[PDB]
Amino acid sequence: TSEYQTFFNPRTFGSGEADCGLRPLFEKKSLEDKTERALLESYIAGRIVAGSDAEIGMSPWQVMLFRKSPQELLCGASLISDRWVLTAAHCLLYPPWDKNFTENDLLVRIGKHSRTRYERNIEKISMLEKIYIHPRYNWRENLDRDIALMKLKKPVAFSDYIHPVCLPDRETAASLLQAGYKGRVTGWGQPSVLQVVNLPIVERPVCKDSTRIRITDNMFCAGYKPDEGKRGDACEGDAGGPFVMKSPFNNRWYQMGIVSWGEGCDRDGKYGFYTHVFRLKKWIQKVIDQFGE
């Protein structure tokens, strides 16, 4: 009994929205992951330090984006439906590096927890029907509008390990997406299981002051001041993967950001910059509706 008003047409979006952002191995079993209370600034088993290993099923919207041949790990991504996947544009299109991947170059692995171990009946491979990149994606400057959608060849089957994440409404965005609230990034970064780091959202004027890159409203930032030592490293989060927050309103995980880039990954305190998913919902709806059926 946790209420959620679906936003998208299941005809174009595929299925998954009504039950989005509730994890089968956690919210559905009345269980909690080892660090989610830390997002509430509450510490129960001791200060963890830096980032740590995710538990089986902690992040069932996690999607890895691979280059087909030769098989190499390109980026993170997130599953928002059985049919649609979110990622960062520069993962696919980056001219300064002569990077321009299309559907045929790529596959996605969904449901993985380890990496030095395959997963029977657990991880799914899936090919891509089509890639959609924001047309005002700016790679020349600041990575403005760093967001892309990828449609799966065939809809994936949801399991305990595969389940989509929710996308925010105005009210959720207005309330969760503010300084001092904490979010969560995940990445593979030699570590051998998916790493989780929790990070506080940083105020816009401080984000603007940490860098000479022009920061636009299509971006937010999270992390700790260059002062602040062994805390939690934003740069652990793989480019294009999700920045997620738990709504106290309804116990649901919402994807607030797409990991775009890191600032000062060579400092004591690192800041992460994220594509503002809510400011882009308009564009996401536009592509799902045009291209989803």
Question: By what technique were these coordinates determined?
Answer: X-ray
Angstrom distance (rounded) from CA 254 to CA 247: 7
Angstrom distance (rounded) from CA 5 to CA 248: 15
CATH topology match: 46-59+165-278 vs 60-164+279-293:
yes
Angstrom distance (rounded) from CA 116 to CA 129: 28
Residue type, 41: E
Q: H or E segment at 242? A: strand 242-246
CA dihedral 158, 159, 160, 161 (to 10 degrees): -70
φ, ψ (nearest 5 deg) of residue 156? -85, 150
Which of 259, 257, 256, 219 is closest to 239 using CA atoms?
259
The stretches of the chain forming alpha helices (DSSP H) are 10-13, 170-176, 204-209, 277-291
- Options 3.90.1150.10, 2.60.40.2130, 2.40.10.10, 3.30.565.10; which CATH number does 46-59+165-278 get? 2.40.10.10
CA-to-CA separations, 99 to 13, 51, 105, in angstroms, rounded: 28, 30, 11
CATH architecture of 60-164+279-293: Beta Barrel (2.40)
Q: Which residue has the tokens 């959720």?
A: 172
As a three-state string, the secondary structure of 46-101 is: CCCCCCEECCCCCCCCEEEEEEECCEEEEEEEEECCCCEEEECHHHCEEHHHCEEC
Q: 102: which strand partners? A: none
The stretches of 123-264 forming alpha helices (DSSP H) are 170-176, 204-209
Q: Measured at the alpha carbon of residue 110, what is the angle toward residues 104 and 115, in degrees to the nearest 5?
A: 105
- Domain spans of the chain, in order of start: 46-59+165-278, 60-164+279-293
Q: Which residue has the tokens 């989509």?
A: 164
Resolution rounded to one decimal, in angstroms: 2.4
Q: 63: which strand partners? A: 77, 110
Q: Measured at the alpha carbon of residue 181, what is the angle toward residues 86 and 246, in degrees to the nearest 5?
A: 50
Which of 159, 122, 123, 156 is closest to 24 using CA atoms?
159
